[PDB]
Every structure is written in structure tokens, then in C-alpha cells.
Design a protein around this ligand. Structure first.
Ligand SMILES: Nc1ncnc2c1ncn2[C@@H]1O[C@H](COP(=O)(O)OP(=O)(O)OP(O)(O)=S)[C@@H](O)[C@H]1O
Ligand SMILES: Nc1ncnc2c1ncn2[C@@H]1O[C@H](COP(=O)(O)OP(=O)(O)OP(O)(O)=S)[C@@H](O)[C@H]1O
Ligand SMILES: [Mg+2]
Ligand SMILES: [Mg+2]
Length: 1157
């Protein structure tokens, strides 16, 4: 449970921690040892000074070198240990994420995970770093001061000590509370990150439907809750230190009241009391030094909760286990028997009510039925993605649950219904099928899958960089690449899930011939809705209610006049000083004013304790009337109490006004940044440097890095600067000629700080540039887990992540040495200065240039700034990283796009009739400028007409759809809506009228009702309209049959539904707007013949009154089109009515002559 974050420590890390703790103890035992000679001189003061102060200077000079070594040994080893354990924890967390099963991904939300690697890990990196060394040093100083107090005093030290246990108990309680608070804060941040990645992954649909504001508010709610938690966290963290300081000062007042009895009892001398006080009081500031370390440790302990909860889990179907069975001569034989299955998300519904199947080697089985019977369900069940509730699945007699999972999945080549590619080159995507593949095999596969032509046509032939999820390829090229990826594997069992949809007739024929050439040695399962591809199948079977009903050859099933017969008959780099972020925080200026004033008050009091001590020294060395000693000293007994009451008031506010002011700004720093990328042009998201992982990592990383240096950590920096200023002013006022000696070392410390800052600033930029690359791989593997599991590429992704985590590891190791050396230098130069100042004070009192009663005061005041100097020097890395973080935040905020979604300038005509005119339009994509996709096309559409765009795959038919929505602007030519340029028209007004259906629809993680209602924004869509649209899309019956009718959540990108169901939902979403212009892009690609007829009749009924542009391959849909436009290398070569182009025996005639039985 506790100390669970150190469970990846070797012998070396334990050695590092042990030696670092010892060095911290030695280094912290330095300051209390300097008070012995202080008290001895004070007692003697109540031929010898030049004999004593010189040996005191000798001792100080020796302690200086001791500290010089000990501080480095303390800092560097702890930093190295923290870096190594952080690297191991990251690596093992990713490994444990890879080990989970598909059902776990379905039940849980993976959106949190991507933001748990970046932020949640980093917080741990602060709790187990050098902060533990600082806490150990503070504890050592506390105990050494109390030990020397015991040696020089018996009862006063015990009286002071009598109040330590309550302080420890209070610290423990507050740490426990805020550790619990940190968990909820991090959970809220995780929810915000999940929303951010969900919005960023489907940016094209969000831009198309103009739903930026709704997603912005949905993201802002979680930030508001995070701020609400952070305020309470700051409040309790501040009370933790305020109560401690108040108790310390009350204890000091009681101790002084007791010690004033020296005059009456006579047991002790004034020198002993002065020694005891001056030695004990160092612990009073050691507690304040220690508290932030406890805060950071509690934060890290609260952060490790979910990380180790995830790692501690154990899957049921583990792909990494090698304890399975495996055969050698595997023959192709598939056997389903009494398979009952239900998905984990919806356990109540039954999908397979018991089916049986037998497939022999060299056999092609086709499964035919309506949408929702469970064809893809049994395809997934074959790969052992899920385990059936009842019955068993076997290959060659042996049960699936017995043989090895990795071996079983390595002999199955699967093409899923919707291919998913990765953000790499084409060659790497092909090579992902099998690791050890030569170029010859890849060439053979891409020739067999009919993908050789367009690959050679592109520049960077086999190194062309595809986008995320293969978004930079076409709709058919993606499917061909997936087919080639499956064919590289050379599998015993091949499973195709409608791999013949996007391909046209020629490519389909080529692929079918190539596949049938080597059909004898394979076992094959094919899922298809077209029936021409099923004609040449070895055996055809029919689904109904999840159970198989029909079997046999084509002729036998036709004679059986069953489902198959019915279907056949129906078919007939600017650096910024971060002071700009300070200026951005201007609105909360009173908080800063109160914080600075309070910090000045409570920081400049510790040196003033030297003046107080000198005054109570003088009150003892009076001449007469001891009664005033009972009286005057009594006055001081009040003062120590009074300060405490102020201290509680001050040490609270100093942290609060600052701590709150950070929480206000951090939210404002995210809310704006997300408001900026949500505005950027689509071409900005095509930049390889910008990917969902990079953006989602940046969102958390920039704000966290700024908050690290901008938060309550600045309060202690201000306090310590005030302490140094008060000390130097006190030394300048009472003493003199010694402030110059103390300032003689400022240039050296300044040079050390400058060089440290320069080196850390050089390091941080290179670390930041690679952290995004580290996060991209994590998000790319997380979002496409089904494809990765099916390809068994879990080891390669883990290796790539480990390779990406390399440079930050080296930078973290080097930072340890750099920081340790600088810390030791600045910590030792000041002890050397103390020795020099003591010697010079001895000389000055020898020459009668200045008394010793006041150089005593000067030394006492100056020595109190050692811990302050240490704290100030411990602020380098935070500012070093926050500088570039603020620079990048300002850069992203100040950027403006070219096509502004938020702008209001433009023309918004009252009425439009709906003419579309493309005139001599040429266009080139930004990522591949050299490739011409459109070469001067012209398109004319009037109101109440339907245009069908046809052509070979990759001819630019969806490019016009992208252009009409103003995703990109053409290089030349003209685009006119109602005789007016779209450039002059308003962008949001243009996008609010026309609705589109993408080539591959993407939904969101919410209910079906909200998914349908998302079509029309800036309006509350009534439930009646939603139901009417669902009925018009022929999905109302299925939705109503579903338990939790309209409240069932659709999974990430719409995976809890079949392809046809979510395509119908997308059509319904597009039809809610009742758009004046409709853009259909393969809307009927995956639809049953009944849903197709219903949707077609619905669109035909309301054809008059609106404009529609359809892109399709099925010629039956194109039959009803008013006019048809044929593409040819970008140009439009044929245009006219159906009959006119029927007479002109061109490409359309070629496509219609091939669909004849
Ligand atoms: N991951 C999932 N979790 C829960 N239910 C699911 C999931 N995937 C699919 N379903 C349900 O399974 C049923 C149909 O799923 P599928 O087996 O994919 O249908 P299908 O045969 O693939 O349809 P076609 O022929 O591909 S258009 C529907 O009721 C879906 O809601
Ligand atoms: N983001 C992109 N950057 C550069 N080129 C792209 C991008 N997306 C697509 N292309 C190319 O532009 C052409 C247009 O094809 P796509 O619109 O992607 O799909 P498609 O198969 O052509 O569908 P249509 O309707 O026929 S255009 C193809 O040559 C694609 O390879
Ligand atoms: Mg399917
Ligand atoms: Mg296409």
C-alpha cells in the first residue's frame, strides 16, 4: 500500500538512497555546530580574541569543504535515483497497459490513460527527487540543534522539545488529507484530457458541424472542478505551516519565560541561555524548510494510486503468456459449436443464440444476412478477442482456450470492416504484418493487392507519409493497403470483413483473381453484402436471429428459396521572458499585492530575531534593581507570543493569495490554449509535428510546467529574498565594513547561476521536443488497440516507446550532476564568506574600529540566511523549464489562422436558392504540393437537382466536398454559391446550411440522442424531431428494441455499433438540419437492401426544394441521379442526363456493361 512507488528499486538505487541520506545528515549537521563558539564568545564577553576567533575561522573553513562535498553527494545521488525509478515506472506502466484485454478497453475509458503518462508520472518525479534529501537535511539540522542544546542546557531544551510530537502529528494529518485531495484533482484533469483527445481526434466533423463552442464548454467544466479542488488543497497546505509556526513561537515564548528565572534560581548563566536559544531556534526555520518537501511527497503518494492500480491488474486472455499449447502441422479446420455470446458493454442483450459451423481446408465460407446478426461478432470471436459464454470454438479439434494466444493470432490474417493505419510510411504499414519481411515480399504483396500503381505514382514511392489513422490516403487506397498488410502475413486462416466495398469493379476483379490463385492452401471466411463476390464461394450460409439457418451451394440455396434467394431476387522559435504571463495575470493584482506585503513581513523577521536577542542580552547586563528583570524581561515574554499570533495570520495569507492566484491563472492558461487550436485551420492539423498525442501531451505539459514555478513556490522565493535583504540591511546599519566582504562573493554565485541556467535552458528545449514524440506513440497505440492486438504488434510498440524515452533519461541523469555541483558551490562559498567575515571582525575589534558586542550581532543576523540561500538556489530548474513553457504558450495563443471560424466579418444573405458553380478550379494539397489532384474542373448545380460524381478511385470526388466546406482554398479558379464567392461569404453561416456525410463516419462517446441532436447546433433539438429523423433513416426500430432506447452510449469513434448501424445514425444526424444542400459521400456503402430502399425513398420524397450531390459506386443509386459527372485526372469529361450519357458509350457505359449477369 504505502511506499508502493519504490517497488522498482535495484541494489544500486537503494545504495544511492542510503548514501544520499547519510550525506544529507552530514550536511544538515553543519549549521547547529557553529552556534557553540557563538555562545562561548557571548558568555566570555560578559589577547584572547585574536587567539579564539582565528581558530573559530579555521573550524568554519573546514566545515566549508565538508559541506562542499556533502551537498553534492546528497543532491546528485537522490536525483539519479529519482530519474531511474521514473524511467522504470513509465516503461512498466506502458507494458501493463499493453497487457489488458479488449473487454477491459470496452468497459473503461482509455481517454484518461494518455494524460496519466504525462502529468501523473511527472508529479511523482517531484516527490521522490531531491526533496527527500532536503527534508532529511532539515531533520538533521533540527536534531543537531536540539542535541547541542542538550549538551549546553538541561531543562530549557527539554521544555522546547515538549511540543514536537504534536507538530509531527499535525504534519502527518495534513499530508494525509491533501494526498487524498490530489487523487480527485488528478481524476478531474484526466477527464478534461479525455474530452480534449476525443475532440481533437475527430476535428473534421466538429469543424463541419460547427460544434466548437459546445466542446469548449464541456472541456471547461472539468477545469472549473479542478480549480475548485486546488483552492481547498492550497488552503489546507497553508494551514499546515501556519499552525506549526504559531506553535513554535508559543513554545519559544514559554521557554523564555522559564529561562528568565536564571536571576532568581541562579542555576544557569546568561551565556548558556543564549546558546540554547540561538541553537534551538535554527530548528524553528528547519521546520519551514521541511514542510514543502512533505507537501510534494504527499502529492506523489496520492498520484501513484491509479498508476499502481492499473499495473496491479491481471488479464484473463493474456497475450504475453507463454504457458499455452501449440501444434506444428496445423491443418485448416474451423469448428463452431453451440456458441452463445454477449458483449461485455451490453450483457443483457444476446447476439449469438447458438450457432454451429464446420469449415475444411481449402474451403471458402460466405456469411449472408441483414445488419446486426453478428457476422463481425463471430469473426472477432475467432481471434479469441472475447470468450463465448457457452459452447466452444476449436481449430483442428483442439479447443481455442487451450492453445497459445500469440501463436493462434499469428496464423490468422484479418481484414476488418474499417481499416486503421498508423502514422508511419507506407512501407512500415505493410511491414507491420510480419516483422521480418524483405522488400521483395512487400512488392509481391502490393502487386497482388493491386496497390502497385498509385504507390509508384507518388513521390517518395514507398516512403510516402500517411496521416493519422490513414487520413492522408484515399478511401480505396487505404483498403488496398490493409489487404496487402493482411496478405504479407501469409496466413493459414484468412478472415475478410467486407474488404470489397471501396474498390471499384476492376480493382475488385484483380484482387479476387489474385486471391483465388492461392485459395487451395488457405482456409477462408468472407463477409459481404454484395452477391456477385459470393457467387464463386465454395459454401454460402445465412444468419438469422444470430443462428445459422441455411447451408449448401449456390444452386441448392436458390432451390431452397430461402434468405439467400430473397436477397438475390431483391438485388436482381521566439524566446519569451514569461513576464508576459505575469502581465496576463494582471487581473488578480490585489492577491499579488497582499502576498508580497505579507511575505516581506514574515521573511524579514528571522534576522530581526538577532536584534531581539541582542536586546535581551543587554537587559540582563543592567546595573541595579533585579525586580525590573522580572518586569522588563516579562515584556519580551509577550513579544514572542505576539509574533506567533501574527505568524499564523501571515504564513497563511502569504501562501493563500499566491496559491489561489496560481489556480485562477492555470485554468485561464488552458481555457485559452484549447480555444486556440480549436480555431486553427484544417491544414494545421495535417502537419506531422501536430498529432493527437502531441497536442494532448502539450496541453497538460505546458500548464503543469508553468504552474510548477508560478504557484506557491514563488512565495518562499519572495520570503527568502526578503530575508536576505533584511539581513544585509541589518548588517549595514549596526555593523559596517563587513557588508562589502559579504558582497564580495555575489559575482561568483551570479556566474554559477548564469551558467547553470544556460545549460538547463539548453537541455529543456531538447527534452520537450522529444516528450511529444514519446506521447504520440502511446496515443497511437492506445487509440488503435484492436488493430494492434489483431496484428500482435504489442512488442514493437513497447520497443518504440522505450526508444523514445531514451533522450529524456540521459538529460535527467545529466541534470543531477549539474544541479548537485551548482548547489554545492553556492552552499560552500557562503560558509567561506562566514569564515572570512569572522576573521575580519576579529581584526576590526582588535584595532578598536568597532566593538565586539555589535559584530556579534552582525554575525548572528547574517548566519540566519544560509537556509534562505539554499532555497533560492533550489529554484533553478523550475524557472529554467517554465521559461520555454511560457514562450510556447504565448506562441500558440497569439497565432491566428487564415480561415477564421470565430470571425464575424462576411456577407450573410437573408435568402439563398442553392446554385453551386465550380469554375476552372485547380487545387493542390498542402502536405503534397507537387501532386495535382484537381486540374481545372468545372461543375454546375441548380436547385432541385441531383448530381452523381463518378470516376476511378483517387480522381478527386471527395476533394470537391472538402472544398465546398472551406477546409482548404483553391490555388486558382472560382467557387460560387448563389453567384457569390464563398471567400466573401461568412464561414460559419456557410457551414450552418449544408450538411455532409463523410466517407467514414465518426461518432462520439455519448448517447445516441445527443449524437443525432449534434447535427443542428445553436438550437435545442426536440425529441420529436430526433425520432422523426431516426424513422427517416430506418434505425428507429433497432433503437427502440435496444434497452435504454436513446441513452445507450456509443463507444469511442462509434465502435459499440456495426458499420451499417452507425452509418444510418450518421445519415440521421445529417438529416436533422433539413439542409438546403446535402453532400452524400458513399452514404449507402454498407447498408442492407431494405434500409437502402427506405433511405432512398425518404431522400427522393423531399428531393424537391433542396440540392443534393452524391458520390457513389453502386449504379442503382446513380440511376436516379438527375445528372452525372465523370472524372478523368481531375478534369470533368462527361456531363449530362442519364439518357444522354447512356447514348454516349463512354466510361459510364463500361461500368454499366460489367454489372450484367
Ligand atoms: N463492441 C461492441 N460492444 C457492444 N455491442 C456491440 C459491439 N460491437 C457490436 N455490437 C452490437 O452487435 C450488433 C451487431 O454487431 P455486428 O456483429 O458488427 O453486426 P454486423 O454483422 O457486423 O453488421 P454488418 O453486416 O457488418 S453491416 C449490434 O447490436 C451492435 O450494437
Ligand atoms: N490529407 C491529404 N493530403 C494530401 N493528399 C491527400 C490527402 N487526403 C487525400 N489525399 C489525396 O488526394 C486524392 C483524393 O482522394 P481522397 O479524397 O482522399 O479519397 P478518394 O478515393 O479520392 O475519394 P474520392 O471521392 O474519389 S476524391 C488522392 O490521391 C489522395 O491520395
Ligand atoms: Mg460488420
Ligand atoms: Mg474514393
Amino acid at each position: 500500500s504505502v511506499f508502493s512507488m519504490f517497488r522498482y528499486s535495484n541494489w544500486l538505487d537503494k545504495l544511492y538512497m542510503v548514501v544520499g541520506t547519510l550525506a544529507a545528515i552530514i550536511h544538515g549537521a553543519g549549521l547547529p555546530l557553529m552556534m557553540l563558539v557563538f555562545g562561548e564568545m557571548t558568555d566570555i564577553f560578559a589577547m584572547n580574541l585574536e587567539e579564539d576567533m582565528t581558530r573559530y575561522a579555521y573550524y568554519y573553513s573546514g566545515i566549508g569543504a565538508g559541506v562542499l562535498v556533502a551537498a553534492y553527494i546528497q543532491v546528485s545521488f537522490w536525483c539519479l535515483a529519482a530519474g531511474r525509478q521514473i524511467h522504470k515506472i513509465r516503461k512498466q506502466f506502458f507494458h501493463a497497459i499493453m497487457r489488458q484485454e479488449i473487454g477491459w478497453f470496452d468497459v473503461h475509458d482509455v481517454g484518461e490513460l494518455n494524460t496519466r503518462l504525462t502529468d501523473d508520472v511527472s508529479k511523482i518525479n517531484e516527490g521522490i527527487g531531491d526533496k527527500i534529501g532536503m527534508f532529511f537535511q532539515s531533520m538533521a539540522t533540527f536534531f543537531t540543534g536540539f542535541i547541542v542544546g542538550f549538551t549546553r542546557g538541561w531543562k530549557l531544551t527539554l521544555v522546547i522539545l515538549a511540543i514536537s510530537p504534536v507538530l509531527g502529528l499535525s504534519a502527518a494529518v495534513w499530508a494525509k488529507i491533501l494526498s487524498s485531495f490530489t487523487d480527485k484533482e488528478l481524476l478531474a484533469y484526466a477527464k478534461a484530457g479525455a474530452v480534449a483527445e476525443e475532440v481533437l481526434a475527430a476535428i473534421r466533423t466538429v469543424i463541419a458541424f460547427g460544434g466548437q463552442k459546445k466542446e469548449l464548454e464541456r472541456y471547461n467544466k472539468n477545469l472549473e472542478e479542478a480549480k475548485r479542488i486546488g483552492i481547498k488543497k492550497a488552503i489546507t497546505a497553508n494551514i499546515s505551516i501556519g499552525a506549526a509556526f504559531l506553535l513554535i513561537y508559543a513554545s519559544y515564548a514559554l521557554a523564555f519565560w522559564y529561562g528568565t528565572t536564571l536571576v532568581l534560581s541562579g542555576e544557569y548563566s546568561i551565556g548558556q541561555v543564549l546558546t540554547v536559544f540561538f541553537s534551538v531556534l535554527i530548528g524553528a526555520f528547519s521546520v519551514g524548510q521541511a514542510s514543502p518537501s512533505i507537501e510534494a511527497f504527499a502529492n506523489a503518494r496520492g498520484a501513484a494510486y491509479e498508476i499502481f492500480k492499473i499495473i496491479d491488474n491481471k488479464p484473463s486472455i493474456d497475450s504475453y503468456s507463454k504457458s499455452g499449447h501449440k501444434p506444428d502441422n496445423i491443418k485448416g479446420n474451423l469448428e463452431f459449436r453451440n456458441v452463445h455470446f454477449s458483449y461485455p458493454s451490453r450483457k443483457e442483450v444476446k447476439i449469438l443464440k447458438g450457432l454451429n459451423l464446420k469449415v475444411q481446408s481449402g474451403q471458402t465460407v460466405a456469411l449472408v444476412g441483414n445488419s446486426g446478426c453478428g457476422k463481425s461478432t463471430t469473426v472477432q470471436l475467432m481471434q479469441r478477442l472475447y470468450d463465448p459464454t457457452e459452447g466452444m470454438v476449436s481449430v483442428d479439434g483442439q479447443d481455442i482456450r487451450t492453445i497459445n494466444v500469440r501463436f493462434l493470432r499469428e496464423i490468422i490474417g484479418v481484414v476488418s470492416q474499417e481499416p486503421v493505419l498508423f502514422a508511419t510510411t507506407i512501407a512500415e504499414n505493410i511491414r507491420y504484418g510480419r516483422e521480418n519481411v524483405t522488400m521483395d515480399e512487400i512488392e509481391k504483396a502490393v502487386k497482388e493487392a493491386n496497390a502497385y500503381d498509385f504507390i509508384m505514382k507518388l513521390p517518395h514511392k514507398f516512403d510516402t507519409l500517411v496521416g493519422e489513422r490513414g487520413a492522408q490516403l484515399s478511401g480505396g487506397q487505404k483498403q488496398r493497403i490493409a489487404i496487402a498488410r493482411a496478405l504479407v502475413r501469409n496466413p493459414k486462416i484468412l478472415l475478410l470483413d467486407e474488404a470489397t466495398s471501396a474498390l471499384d469493379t476492376e480493382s475488385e476483379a484483380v484482387v479476387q483473381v489474385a486471391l483465388d490463385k492461392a485459395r487451395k492452401g488457405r482456409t477462408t471466411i468472407v463477409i459481404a453484402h454484395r452477391l456477385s463476390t459470393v457467387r464463386n464461394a465454395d459454401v454460402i450460409a445465412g444468419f438469422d436471429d444470430g443462428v445459422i439457418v441455411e447451408k449448401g451451394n449456390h444452386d441448392e440455396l436458390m432451390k431452397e428459396k430461402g434468405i439467400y434467394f430473397k436477397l438475390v431476387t431483391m438485388q436482381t522559435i521566439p524566446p519569451v521572458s514569461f513576464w508576459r504571463i505575469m502581465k496576463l495575470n494582471l487581473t488578480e493584482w490585489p492577491y499579488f499585492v497582499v502576498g508580497v506585503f505579507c511575505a516581506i513581513i514574515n521573511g524579514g523577521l528571522q534576522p530581526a530575531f538577532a536584534i531581539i536577542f541582542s536586546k535581551i542580552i543587554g537587559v540582563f547586563t543592567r546595573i541595579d534593581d533585579p525586580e525590573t528583570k522580572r518586569q522588563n524581561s516579562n515584556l519580551f515574554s509577550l513579544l514572542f507570543l505576539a509574533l506567533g499570533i501574527i505568524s499564523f495570520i501571515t504564513f497563511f495569507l502569504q501562501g493563500f493569495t499566491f496559491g489561489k492566484a496560481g489556480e485562477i491563472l492555470t485554468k485561464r492558461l488552458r481555457y485559452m490554449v484549447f480555444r486556440s487550436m480549436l480555431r486553427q485551420d484544417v491544414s494545421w492539423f495535417d502537419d506531422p509535428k501536430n498529432t493527437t498525442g502531441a497536442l494532448t501531451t502539450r496541453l497538460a505539459n505546458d500548464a503543469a510546467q508553468v504552474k510548477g514555478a508560478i504557484g506557491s513556490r514563488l512565495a518562499v522565493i519572495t520570503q527568502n529574498i526578503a530575508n536576505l535583504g533584511t539581513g544585509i540591511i541589518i548588517s549595514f546599519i549596526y555593523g559596517w565594513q563587513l557588508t562589502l566582504l559579504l558582497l564580495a562573493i555575489v559575482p561568483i554565485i551570479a556566474i554559477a547561476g548564469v551558467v547553470e541556467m544556460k545549460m538547463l535552458s539548453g537541455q529543456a528545449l531538447k527534452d520537450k521536443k522529444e516528450l511529444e514524440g514519446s506521447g504520440k506513440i502511446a496515443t497511437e497505440a492506445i487509440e488503435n488497440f484492436r488493430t494492434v492486438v489483431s496484428l500482435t504488434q504489442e512488442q514493437k510498440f513497447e520497443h518504440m516507446y522505450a526508444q523514445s524515452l531514451q533522450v529524456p533519461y540521459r538529460n535527467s541523469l545529466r541534470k543531477a550532476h549539474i544541479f548537485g555541483i551548482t548547489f554545492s558551490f553556492t552552499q560552500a562559498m557562503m560558509y567561506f564568506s562566514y569564515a572570512g567575515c569572522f576573521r575580519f571582525g576579529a581584526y576590526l575589534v582588535a584595532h578598536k574600529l568597532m566593538s565586539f558586542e555589535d559584530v556579534l550581532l552582525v554575525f548572528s543576523a547574517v548566519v540566519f540566511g544560509a537556509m534562505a540561500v539554499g532555497q533560492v538556489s533550489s529554484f533553478a530548474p523550475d524557472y529554467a523549464k517554465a521559461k520555454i513553457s511560457a514562450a510556447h504558450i504565448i506562441m500558440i495563443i497569439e497565432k491566428t489562422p487564415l480561415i477564421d471560424s470565430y470571425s464575424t466579418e462576411g456577407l450573410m444573405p437573408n435568402t439563398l436558392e442553392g446554385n453551386v458553380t465550380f469554375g476552372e478550379v485547380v487545387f493542390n494539397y498542402p502536405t503534397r504540393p507537387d501532386i495535382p489532384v484537381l486540374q481545372g474542373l468545372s461543375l454546375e448545380v441548380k436547385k432541385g437537382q441531383t448530381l452523381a460524381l463518378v470516376g476511378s478511385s483517387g480522381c478527386g470526388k471527395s476533394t470537391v466536398v472538402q472544398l465546398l466546406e472551406r477546409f482548404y482554398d483553391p490555388l486558382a479558379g472560382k467557387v460560387l454559391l448563389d453567384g457569390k464567392e464563398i471567400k466573401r461569404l461568412n464561414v460559419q453561416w456557410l457551414r450552418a446550411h449544408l450538411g455532409i456525410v463523410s466517407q467514414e463516419p465518426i461518432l462520439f462517446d455519448c448517447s445516441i440522442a445527443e449524437n443525432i441532436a449534434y447535427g443542428d447546433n445553436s438550437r435545442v433539438v426536440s425529441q420529436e424531431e430526433i425520432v422523426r429523423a431516426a424513422k427517416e433513416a430506418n434505425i428507429h426500430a433497432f433503437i427502440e428494441s435496444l434497452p435504454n432506447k436513446y441513452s445507450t452510449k456509443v463507444g469511442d469513434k462509434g465502435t459499440q455499433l456495426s458499420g451499417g448501424q452507425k452509418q444510418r445514425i450518421a445519415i440521421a444526424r445529417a438529416l436533422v438540419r433539413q439542409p438546403h444542400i446535402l453532400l452524400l459521400d458513399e452514404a449507402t456503402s454498407a447498408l442492407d437492401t431494405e434500409s437502402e430502399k427506405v433511405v432512398q425513398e425518404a431522400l427522393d420524397k423531399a428531393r424537391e426544394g433542396r440540392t443534393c450531390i452524391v458520390i457513389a459506386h453502386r449504379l442503382s443509386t446513380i440511376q436516379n441521379a438527375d445528372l452525372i459527372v465523370v472524372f478523368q485526372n481531375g478534369r470533368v469529361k462527361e456531363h449530362g442526363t442519364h439518357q444522354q450519357l447512356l447514348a454516349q458509350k463512354g466510361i459510364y457505359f463500361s461500368m454499366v456493361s460489367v454489372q450484367a449477369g
